[PDB]
Design a binder for this molecule. Sequence first.
Ligand SMILES: C=C(C)CCOP(=O)(O)OP(=O)(O)O
Ligand SMILES: CC(C)=CCSP(=O)(O)OP(=O)(O)O
Ligand SMILES: [Mg+2]
Ligand SMILES: [Mg+2]
Lengths: 295, 279, 248, 248
Amino acid sequence: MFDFDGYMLRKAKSVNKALEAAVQMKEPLKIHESMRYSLLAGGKRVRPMLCIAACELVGGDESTAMPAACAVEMIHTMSLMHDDLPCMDNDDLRRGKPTNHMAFGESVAVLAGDALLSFAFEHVAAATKGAPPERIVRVLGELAVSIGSEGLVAGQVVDVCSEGMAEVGLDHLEFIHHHKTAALLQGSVVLGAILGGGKEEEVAKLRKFANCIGLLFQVVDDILDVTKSSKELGKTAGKDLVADKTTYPKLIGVEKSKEFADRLNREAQEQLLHFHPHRAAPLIALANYIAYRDN
Amino acid sequence: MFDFDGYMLRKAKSVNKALEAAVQMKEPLKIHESMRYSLLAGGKRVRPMLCIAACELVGGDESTAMPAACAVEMIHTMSLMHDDLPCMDNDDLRRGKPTNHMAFGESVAVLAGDALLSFAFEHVAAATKGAPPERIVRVLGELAVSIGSEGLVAGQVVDVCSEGMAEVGLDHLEFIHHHKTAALLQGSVVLGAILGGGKEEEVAKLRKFANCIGLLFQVVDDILDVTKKTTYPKLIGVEKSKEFADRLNREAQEQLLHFHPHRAAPLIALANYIAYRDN
Amino acid sequence: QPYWAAIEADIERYLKKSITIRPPETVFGPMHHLTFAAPATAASTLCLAACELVGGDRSQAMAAAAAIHLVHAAAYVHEHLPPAIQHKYGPNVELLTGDGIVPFGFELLAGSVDPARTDDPDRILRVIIEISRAGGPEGMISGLHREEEIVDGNTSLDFIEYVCKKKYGEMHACGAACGAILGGAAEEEIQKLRNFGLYQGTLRGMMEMKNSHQLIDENIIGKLKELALEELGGFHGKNAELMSSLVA
Amino acid sequence: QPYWAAIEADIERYLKKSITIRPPETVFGPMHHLTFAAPATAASTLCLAACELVGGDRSQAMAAAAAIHLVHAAAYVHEHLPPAIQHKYGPNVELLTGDGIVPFGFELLAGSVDPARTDDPDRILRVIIEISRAGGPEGMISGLHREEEIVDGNTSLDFIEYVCKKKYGEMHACGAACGAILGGAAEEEIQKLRNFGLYQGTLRGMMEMKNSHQLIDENIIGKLKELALEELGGFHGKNAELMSSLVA
Ligand SMILES: C=C(C)CCOP(=O)(O)OP(=O)(O)O
Ligand SMILES: CC(C)=CCSP(=O)(O)OP(=O)(O)O
Ligand SMILES: [Mg+2]
Ligand SMILES: [Mg+2]
């Protein structure tokens, strides 16, 4: 038996303990306050757990992956802060509380966000221990690539440039899903796989695996939006309807979307048949939580 | 023939450059800005000069006395900051601009002045170089005694508690003048004499010198006002007060005869200036 | 308790044979009354305890502990003008007396240099630097200043915790650090005590603020106690298990 | 100044071969435009000049100089984020592009590790630490943030000068220090150029703040030039005459 719950419970707590430790209050107090407001507001911490699990899978251990686990979560958090802004989604709720720019105003929100992006790299580069420099620089480079013009950012830009027309291309949409959400999941999986000493083929197989739960992640998120309320999700929801923004439920309804979800989750787990079933259990539990989470 | 003007200008420029370096902008920006607003407002810089001059008088050099010269200027700044507050003189302007609490709020002015006081000790203790630890410690102790309860502060408190009685005695008046003005002049001269390696008897002579110009300044101020609340002219007349002035001046310069007349020129020029100042 | 109470009393006795009311009573009356009406501070206590925890003699840290009490005392007086309650002395005499209290702290220190102890000078200079810093614009004053920005039921815990770190923490770390230094401890053990000090005082400050901000999450007093003790590991002595008192 | 223009152009050419517009044009077009519509920064040139002034070759710090420029470009784009004028790109695309420029900068550094030079891994790690910090919440962001508090004919020169130390200084200090590092200079050398950069960048920042809040006491430009040179002494070389020109 694998007790997923207890597991996520334990990793989440460890990650929240490291996060609070990494971003302390110091001058300028408001920039730091706004960083901590969004970063410790607490979400599922799926990415940090993907990173730690991948490192532990190939043999590494949690403490060498923790600064990297923190770094991806900080990058994740800064993309939500930026996403919620009046010039983006203009949302008022995130993670159970007012969006950052409502609590501190637009400017501190932009800046607090860029500071997180910056500190993610400083944090991985100066605190990672138990890995050789060439490895830590390789990891930093992979983080870069996963979050910029070929990653997270590319998906975000294409997404805002698609809200212009109701005329939705079938694969102007996959491009958005693979970059908007999958890219950073892969980055999390790879940073930890590399850090734990994973061999190239293990890394490549994990990459392919992250791409499936990544495409899955966005599909489930598009479902919950149109089937859950703001209070449940912790964020302003249903706005995918009040925005010419192509999501799967819109393009193929909710039932075919859920169907597509299980298909994705099954393909995900198929990819891990690569590893021993014992090593694989955390990832499999994580593939299932990403798939059946209620929020 | 000694150009006192130029002399004063060189020292002030040196001091201002070091104060500027010692007290920089950093968070909290407002506490620091309030410190600079008052500290770099510029002034005659008489106290840092006396410190530096006393140190070069006994053979030491400027760079060794600089932090202590900076320190006494900070303490003198904090004393003015506090004195301008509403619960004291309640003034709206000083040294050419709005007072510190008017520009930043009462709370920041009080704190900035506290910041100055303690930074004076941190600065002399961590930045002084070219002096042995016990020497630096002796100096910190001298600074302490001159600004506290047997110095600057005791002068201010006894003054404030005398604004009640329209009638006052002569040695109550002299007590205020010695602690209010002279105590920090003596501290200035002694930190420098001691940092320059001055022998104990050279220090003693500079202490006397500092007390006289200090007292002298007040006595002249009292004379100017009248020949233009208890004062010298009211207790002993202007003639006798003028007499007293010349006597203090004479005793100051007598103290300096021990030193190279060339090193003493500024201190002699200064005693004579405090004495015959048109205002 | 006998240990801590007897440390506080030694500090009070010492301040008392040091601050003697005398003519001009208009000056020492207030200097005496304000110095002993200020709540005692664990930063002075921590000074003697750390000194003894590392092997040195309580007497080696008395002037430092006295000095820290005075610096804290002055800041307290300055904090409590405006006329919130009842004062024995006017706002001007109190402002001026705080200005005289801090200097006396340094005087005590300088005058404690025994000249037969080759090591005094250096240790005492160091301590003067630490105490002047903890009490200046980057430490305590930084905290007295941000305090102004607090709003009863509006400002966050994160903010309040930082005000506590500057207002009280910095002073407790200085206390433990100075005791270590007067006691002849090693850099490693000074650093540990300094940190321990920082948390302990941050926590101590969070309590002084429990009485207004009831928002104080029980989890914050927990993270601090825990951070404090994590710090005292590697160290031993009864003060190594007695130091872990104000984190229970 | 022929030498600087060439340093400028070498940086530009490298960027140009590095940032290629490829499909999806919607993403790389803005990345390309904003990166070059950003005013060039002496922080980037300082990087190569400092590398050459200590002994290494320009090629040794191209990636850093390029990463330095990109960090400043994103901050520039993010500094101008209202519909103030009809910019070539909408506000969401510009905010996002800025977020994509910063990481690209770390991608260049990373991929610039030559496993033939035994000492690269470490030099580059430290350069990533120095660059992510100057660009972080305690450096340039400190500056972008307090810049908000300025009321032209109401804020002091002390306030303006500190926003200039955080907004421009820190990055210049970073550039100079990253070149020293990449050129294998010694810690004493690094601190000196670091400081040289902070003064240089602050003074430069005072030039772009002169275009509005013009009550700049010409002695603020004076002390900065002067502090900059008092920094360059102890150093020798062509660039030692040339760096000196950058300030006098
Ligand atoms: C669906 C996308 C692309 C982002 C939201 O991520 P999360 O749903 O992981 O939210 P948090 O748990 O961090 O709050
Ligand atoms: C992937 C990034 C950077 C942001 C989330 S895109 P989204 O607006 O669909 O997600 P949210 O509903 O706002 O959580
Ligand atoms: Mg969006
Ligand atoms: Mg959104």
